Write a protein that binds this ligand. Sequence first.
Ligand SMILES: N[C@H](CC(=O)O)C(=O)Nc1cccc(OC(F)(F)F)c1
Ligand SMILES: [Zn+2]
Length: 288
Amino acid sequence: MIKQRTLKNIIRATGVGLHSGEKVYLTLKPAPVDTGIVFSRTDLDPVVEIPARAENVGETTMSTTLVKGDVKVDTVEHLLSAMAGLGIDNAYVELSASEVPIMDGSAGPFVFLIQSAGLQEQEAAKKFIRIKREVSVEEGDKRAVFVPFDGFKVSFEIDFDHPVFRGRTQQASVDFSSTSFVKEVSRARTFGFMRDIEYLRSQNLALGGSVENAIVVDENRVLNEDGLRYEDEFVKHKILDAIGDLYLLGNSLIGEFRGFKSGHALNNQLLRTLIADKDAWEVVTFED
Ligand SMILES: N[C@H](CC(=O)O)C(=O)Nc1cccc(OC(F)(F)F)c1
Ligand SMILES: [Zn+2]
């Protein structure tokens, strides 16, 4: 049988909060079969646990935030995406503050950490969620769809009205049977804009954003293009966010995702919509 995975080892990393702008302490730990990815706030007494589930998703304004009463964790999408990309079913994620360290603003640091800690196979079948029929959500001009597909494919399109895109719709599509998540999706950074950042810093927000975690754009052009790692990088980060959002299902996905100018709100809306639709999906394990 294809088996569940966790971490061979504990691993500790340090970085800065995307809004606080100050050091935050992160530990990845092995976890038992059928745990899922569980976040815990070790800076509080008692320690508070937030399972990474569709139901526990909060505000979704700029990042995917999980919530439990007054306890929250901001910016979970990049690390969940790394978890989803390397097939990590079970892990504990300890945090000394309210957010995941931003690191370089992509999944690459998390992918690296998970790999260094080692992948540990567990004596239980990997549970996959197969899309049986089409599910879609819409909010104005924004749309997100699930489609039956035998494999894992993700597509994203966005007409972003900024000169750096030369009037062109931005589109990217990744079938993960024939393309590598780590090599071609995991290192993607988003586009920061001096107008958005300029305001946010001056409104006491995103004190962590810089050229270290985003591609800074000035309402005309990318400011130093030395930052780029990919062609069509901005849609690719949309694909990266989408895989982190989709993993709040708690299981790997057999099927197809299509994003039309979507993000955190609509991705979670699509997830809750699918879960509600019992004839839309099923759970399956495989032989190897
Ligand atoms: N997942 C979101 C992307 C989204 O919701 O489109 C994201 O990565 N945001 C993000 C990442 C790094 C820095 C940042 O602040 C900045 F503003 F300073 F750049 C924002
Ligand atoms: Zn992101």
